[PDB]
Design an enzyme around this catalytic site. Structure first.
Site, mmCIF file in Angstrom:
data_model
loop_
_atom_site.group_PDB
_atom_site.id
_atom_site.type_symbol
_atom_site.label_atom_id
_atom_site.label_comp_id
_atom_site.label_asym_id
_atom_site.label_seq_id
_atom_site.Cartn_x
_atom_site.Cartn_y
_atom_site.Cartn_z
ATOM 1 N N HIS A 244 0.770 -1.275 -0.098
ATOM 2 C CA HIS A 244 -0.007 -0.043 -0.119
ATOM 3 C C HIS A 244 1.065 1.305 -0.157
ATOM 4 O O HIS A 244 0.508 2.202 -0.277
ATOM 5 C CB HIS A 244 -0.996 0.040 1.174
ATOM 6 C CG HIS A 244 -0.633 -0.112 2.274
ATOM 7 N ND1 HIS A 244 -0.391 -1.061 3.067
ATOM 8 C CD2 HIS A 244 -0.481 0.954 3.351
ATOM 9 C CE1 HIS A 244 -0.032 -0.947 4.211
ATOM 10 N NE2 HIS A 244 0.018 0.605 4.488
ATOM 11 N N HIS B 278 6.851 6.862 5.502
ATOM 12 C CA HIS B 278 6.216 6.616 4.222
ATOM 13 C C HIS B 278 5.638 7.599 3.722
ATOM 14 O O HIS B 278 5.397 8.845 4.126
ATOM 15 C CB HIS B 278 5.333 5.499 4.344
ATOM 16 C CG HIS B 278 4.186 5.707 5.099
ATOM 17 N ND1 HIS B 278 4.288 5.433 6.562
ATOM 18 C CD2 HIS B 278 2.994 6.182 4.905
ATOM 19 C CE1 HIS B 278 3.157 6.124 7.041
ATOM 20 N NE2 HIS B 278 2.150 6.598 6.150
ATOM 21 N N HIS C 43 2.075 9.033 1.156
ATOM 22 C CA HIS C 43 0.612 8.860 0.406
ATOM 23 C C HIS C 43 0.626 9.791 -1.052
ATOM 24 O O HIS C 43 1.085 10.955 -0.764
ATOM 25 C CB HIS C 43 -0.437 9.398 1.110
ATOM 26 C CG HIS C 43 -0.427 8.276 2.530
ATOM 27 N ND1 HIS C 43 -1.544 7.247 2.701
ATOM 28 C CD2 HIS C 43 0.073 8.395 3.604
ATOM 29 C CE1 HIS C 43 -1.215 6.809 3.920
ATOM 30 N NE2 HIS C 43 -0.276 7.491 4.489
ATOM 31 N N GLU D 104 -3.475 13.484 2.197
ATOM 32 C CA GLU D 104 -4.480 12.878 2.804
ATOM 33 C C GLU D 104 -5.175 14.330 3.869
ATOM 34 O O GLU D 104 -6.559 14.548 3.519
ATOM 35 C CB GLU D 104 -4.032 11.773 3.852
ATOM 36 C CG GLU D 104 -3.424 10.715 3.103
ATOM 37 C CD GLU D 104 -3.399 9.447 3.898
ATOM 38 O OE1 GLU D 104 -2.983 9.371 5.081
ATOM 39 O OE2 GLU D 104 -4.286 8.420 3.525
ATOM 40 N N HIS E 57 4.615 11.075 6.253
ATOM 41 C CA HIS E 57 4.247 10.450 7.435
ATOM 42 C C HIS E 57 5.381 9.990 8.127
ATOM 43 O O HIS E 57 5.783 8.824 7.584
ATOM 44 C CB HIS E 57 2.910 9.444 7.601
ATOM 45 C CG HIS E 57 1.617 10.166 7.076
ATOM 46 N ND1 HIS E 57 0.679 9.485 6.575
ATOM 47 C CD2 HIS E 57 1.678 11.432 6.814
ATOM 48 C CE1 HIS E 57 -0.338 10.183 6.434
ATOM 49 N NE2 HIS E 57 0.329 11.668 6.671
ATOM 50 N N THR F 270 -4.430 6.314 9.205
ATOM 51 C CA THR F 270 -5.316 6.699 8.016
ATOM 52 C C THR F 270 -5.514 5.257 7.061
ATOM 53 O O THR F 270 -6.149 5.541 6.011
ATOM 54 C CB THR F 270 -4.807 7.773 7.139
ATOM 55 O OG1 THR F 270 -3.510 7.313 6.542
ATOM 56 C CG2 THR F 270 -4.573 9.193 7.972
HETATM 57 O O1 LIG Z 1 0.720 6.990 8.523
HETATM 58 C C1 LIG Z 1 0.496 5.910 8.919
HETATM 59 C C2 LIG Z 1 1.036 5.277 10.083
HETATM 60 C C3 LIG Z 1 1.001 3.990 10.500
HETATM 61 C C4 LIG Z 1 0.478 2.849 10.052
HETATM 62 C C5 LIG Z 1 0.128 2.441 8.815
HETATM 63 C C6 LIG Z 1 -0.426 3.491 7.867
HETATM 64 C C7 LIG Z 1 -0.182 5.014 7.750
HETATM 65 O O2 LIG Z 1 -0.596 5.708 6.740
HETATM 66 ZN ZN LIG Z 2 0.457 7.313 6.278
#
Ligand SMILES: O=c1cccccc1O
Ligand SMILES: [Zn+2]
Length: 257
Positions: A61, A91, A93, A103, A116, A195
């Site tokens: 993902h 990571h 998005h 987001e 994030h 999220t």
């Molecule tokens: O920002 C995140 C933090 C932790 C775990 C899963 C997915 C996410 O998009």
């Molecule tokens: Zn995230």
């Protein structure tokens, strides 16, 4: 299982994760006019000079850059927080198009992507315990706009060819996450959630006011990743964002006037 498509995307998640309809879901729209300056907020303290990155993983993902979180090497404290939070992974998005992908939104505006940096509260011992707690996580969110390149991102872009498909990973040692930060640490903050499934409501969100700029080529490279596994039909990893959720009367606070 869950995803971002028409048949398994954000509209469907509540069936397996009913907290999707909870009282403190993320992301949200940040209405800047109604976010109140809180002079009791502290500056953020970002202590990444001893960060130890380990690996990069395409998890189906997103791609996660993972850190050694077995000691206080890279931590977030101050700001709205009352504890020490250890960096575990970052990571992004992002969108299929430059006009969407974040987001959070700011006065309904979408950025091309959102970073994030995920941290857990060290009073809980481990990430897995932290996610059973309402103050277990702190996520530092940073907007990406398309413009000039961000040099400190390029090492991530360079490795993406080696983790194209779900379940691939690569060594990713000696990466300095400080090169992903904007100049200012001015922020908005509110209580929210993961999220992605499982959508747990553990997160003190700290969203930076200042975007970073990345180049069109840098984000293009993100869009060449695949949601699928090797040998499966190719599904480009794009539009892995959840839309804004109802605020439910939470108040967003600003560290800045
Ligand atoms: O920002 C995140 C933090 C932790 C775990 C899963 C997915 C996410 O998009
Ligand atoms: Zn995230």
């Amino acid at each position: 299982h869950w995803g971002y498509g028409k048949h398994n995307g954000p509209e469907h998640w509540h069936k397996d994760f009913p907290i999707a309809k909870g009282e403190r879901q993320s992301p949200v729209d940040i209405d800047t006019h109604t976010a109140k300056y809180d002079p009791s907020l502290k500056p953020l303290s970002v202590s990444y000079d001893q960060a130890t990155s380990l690996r990069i993983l395409n998890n189906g993902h997103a791609f996660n850059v993972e850190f050694d979180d077995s000691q206080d090497k890279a931590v977030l404290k101050g700001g709205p927080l009352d504890g020490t939070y250890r960096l575990i992974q970052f990571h992004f998005h992002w969108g299929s198009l430059d006009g969407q992908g974040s987001e959070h939104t700011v006065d309904k505006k979408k950025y091309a992507a959102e970073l994030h940096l995920v941290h857990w509260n060290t009073k809980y011992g481990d990430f897995g315990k932290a996610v059973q707690q309402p103050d277990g996580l702190a996520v530092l969110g940073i907007f990406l706009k398309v413009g000039s390149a961000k040099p400190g991102l390029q090492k991530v872009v360079d490795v993406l060819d080696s983790i194209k498909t779900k379940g691939k990973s690569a060594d990713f040692t000696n990466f300095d996450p400080r090169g992903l930060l904007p100049e200012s640490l001015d922020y908005w903050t509110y209580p929210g959630s993961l999220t992605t499934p499982p959508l747990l409501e553990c997160v003190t969100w700290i969203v930076l006011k200042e975007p970073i700029s990345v180049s069109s080529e840098q984000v293009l490279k993100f869009r060449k990743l695949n949601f699928n596994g090797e040998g499966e039909p190719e599904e480009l990893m794009v539009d892995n964002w959840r839309p804004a959720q109802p605020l439910k009367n939470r108040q967003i606070k600003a560290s800045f006037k």
